[PDB]
Design a protein around this ligand. Structure first.
Ligand SMILES: [Cl-]
Ligand SMILES: [Cl-]
Lengths: 245, 245, 245, 245
């Protein structure tokens, strides 16, 4: 019944989300950067565990690339009911060392992406009277973080987008929500030297452990569900207690 | 497998929560005020739709009454894995007309209740390394509301409790979360003259409709689930967009 | 012109506030617990420093005690234009060890006090079309703290109260705001071993120092000023960057 | 002693800020868009009112434009101690109708500007151990607004930036804070038909009036003061009670 698009859906958190949405019964489409050569290996690996996906290349930072990609998906698969804006990078540098190139890379990939991917899907969801849009932020959007003037600006901006869009289209049966994960067990975090995990990262987390990508995926699946229609404009923290407010 | 206690579990939101938790597979125990004569009619109605509950009388405002009630439940049913602090009243009056009697009734029933019900269950959850505590607040805790200096103080206080407890026991596998519903279709809200619903209440809600108690129950069930262990110290808004922050 | 009441005004943060408001041109009245035998000492000290204050015994936990104190202040000094609810205590214990006595002491002194002290002064403020109420909270109300389910509940509750009352009387030229301080250099904190200050306290504060009570008092003075009339229902953090949201 | 830069300083809120900081004893420099031909008129007016300012053309959306402007200000006037990022625009359109041009105009002018203007002044502030950065947001960043997915994204983004930068430099005596105004009596708003003010704007504001630009400027002056050094990473609401959280 529902068709879901997950940007950056073939790796890390993206992948957990795509798998969970698939297992919830949705038809899942993922997007990947043109530079990523693994979409055929990934679709075969996924077919081997018995999950059928589609996959499209896009540059989420480029408006026309996104309009095109979404047109193809609607042609080939069908109308988008669910969108998870998960694509995003970091270019961590203190403000004193941060240059315009790396400011821009983060704002364009992480926040412009939200406009570029969301605009082409909304009119259909409004026209059918049902939609779910989930913007994947970060605890560092809420809290701030050293070396992340760019990343926290983009991720906090994403929730400003969430709120305004939510107000525009709530009455038509479309929800818009932000999810802000803390530290997860993914390739970037798990490569940290063990002593830094144990003496720097884990002490910041009351739960005393990393989050699993599958846990965050379960929350995204709840928000995309039929009975989550009264939750809109929210920012849901899934962070082990690392930050509360 | 899990045993859940829902205060005020036999009516309004309480009941939706108890039903949903039952249908999720939990063994559900409800509490009711000694003044409520309907526990036998309710348990029969519930048995008729095929749900097995237990029900205990308690005064959530009284510490010893709660310790006793929880002892009986542990004796008769077994150890408490899940607690939903849902009991709560309103005594709405502007501060200028509000007297100490009605200030107290709300603070004692709505906030002291959280201490009184939660304290006797925590040591077991910590000892087994698993627990879920869900505190049911209100959008008026976040936003404030005219005539609710007492109610918003109690409901905002509940989330202060949530945060501190969450920090104390996160490392032992126990989560503590607040849920803040907006306007729901329950007997108090549905009795409002139709014109007031249409010209005063609904215009405050971007979704353009009341929430269902079952919707809030679905969110509580998500928080009590096995895969919601990385969400703790949160306050999740389920309000149709009525308030965002 | 303005007459200000500062509960707990003879010591710690309350002192700094009383001093600052005096020096801003207000006539300052303080309250103290009837079992505090330091009033003559504090007045003598203040007089030798050139400041004139009135000091009245009150039990802020007791509604009639507060009502009678304010009536006396209105007879002997004049109508109250400014109230700063600064009185409050701690009784820190984890929930597993916290007894009802110590839950209650903190809820009644810290939260019931806002109702007890604020109710007898609001009508006047409203009738004259001008007033300032400032509720002194804590960073621990925003973030929670181990050992402070009682304190965080009371201090978060205070801000619930702030919001609801602000909505009730904003139209009449009365403002109500919360101030949430972090770690301050009061006698209590500056008596923490230097060692614990360096390894446990200061690392929580990006500013790398304790706040001065004078600095918090400058903020209260700002909120009590004639030009702060458009700030209402807010919770202003003054914590050296210890918590942000 | 202190040298202050106020972007957008010749009109509206920026004007009130520039005036207030001047009157607080600071040496105030303003910036304006190079296509604004009003600088001589504004200086003449200010001079006749007894205030002396310097005004420099800048494109806040352009990184090199801002870097060269600050270098000129440092040569002709002196090192910048205070920066108020007040410049910003609106291009209101619902997402369904919003084009990339108008997304971009607002992200670049409102959000990239904080990076462009703040980066060239931070090192100085850090080297001397004193600085104040104030980012002017909006109530619509906190709450979202119909037609403002772009504006809310930029203004919420600004506060993301505030938090991360505050964490980076708090240890060096530099503060970074956001101020979020509600409806203000600027030329634009006071030109809304009286009719729309009464039925559409004022009912959103518990205070029952528009804010004065002077009132917001008094808050900025407070944050820029010597005694506000322990306030950092905050977002202070000045909205007549329009939004609370
Ligand atoms: Cl005392
Ligand atoms: Cl300009």
């Amino acid at each position: 019944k529902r068709i879901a698009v997950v940007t950056g859906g073939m790796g890390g958190l993206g992948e957990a989300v795509s798998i969970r949405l698939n297992d919830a019964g949705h038809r899942v489409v993922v997007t990947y950067s043109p530079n990523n050569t693994g979409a055929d290996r990934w679709l075969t690996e996924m077919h081997a565990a018995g999950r059928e996906f589609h996959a499209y290349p896009v540059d989420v930072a480029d408006h026309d690339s996104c309009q095109q990609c979404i047109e193809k998906i609607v042609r080939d698969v069908g109308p988008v009911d669910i969108l998870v804006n998960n694509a995003g990078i970091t270019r961590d540098m203190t403000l004193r060392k941060l240059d315009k190139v790396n400011w821009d890379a983060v704002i364009r990939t992480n926040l412009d992406s939200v406009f570029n991917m969301t605009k082409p899907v909304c009119d259909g969801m409004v026209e059918r009277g049902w939609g779910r849009i989930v913007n994947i932020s970060s605890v560092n959007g809420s809290k701030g973080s050293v070396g992340q003037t760019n990343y926290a600006a983009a991720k906090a901006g994403m929730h400003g987008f969430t709120k305004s869009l939510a107000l525009e289209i709530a009455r038509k049966g479309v929800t818009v929500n932000t999810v802000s994960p803390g530290y997860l067990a993914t390739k970037m975090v798990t490569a940290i030297p063990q002593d830094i995990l144990d003496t720097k990262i884990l002490p910041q987390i009351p739960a005393g452990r990393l989050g699993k990508p599958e846990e965050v995926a379960a929350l995204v699946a709840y928000l995309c569900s039929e009975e989550a229609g009264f939750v809109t404009g929210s920012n849901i923290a899934i962070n082990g207690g690392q930050h509360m407010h």
